[PDB]
Structures are given as structure tokens and as C-alpha cells.
Amino acid sequence: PGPPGPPGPPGPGPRPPGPPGPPGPPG
Amino acid sequence: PPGPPGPPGPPGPGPRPPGPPGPPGPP
Amino acid sequence: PPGPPGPPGPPGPGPRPPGPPGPPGPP
Do B25 and C21 make contact, defined as CB atoms within 8 angstroms? Predict the structure, then answer.
């Protein structure tokens, strides 16, 4: 039997939403 | 001969921007 | 005969959404 073949192709992962924005300014 | 390439690797989660600033407050 | 299949490829981080709007501002 020959040697093992090459490594498989490389596997990008899934995309969390950012935090809530800061409080708004004064009215 | 050498074997065939392996299968594709595993999937790689991406990093978490802050939301928009909130509405203006009371007058 | 041909050798064994290669190992699985290496793992693939995914893409970075913005957060929701912040709270209403103060007076």
C-alpha cells in the first residue's frame, strides 16, 4: 500500500450581534 | 501510489459593532 | 494499491451584526 494522501482542503466559521448602542443625547 | 486527499476540514464563530445611539431624551 | 486517504483538512473565524439602538437619552 502507498503512503497516505495529502491533507484535505481547509475548512470560514459562522458570523454575535453587537451590544446595544449607548444612551441618546439630551432632548 | 499515494492515497487521495482527505476531506475538507471543519468549519472555523466570528467576533461580535455597538448599536446606534438611542433617541434624544426629554426637552 | 493506492495508499489511504489523507487526514481531514485544518479548521477554517467567521465574519464579524451591529447591535440594536441604545436607550432614549436623559433630560
Answer: no
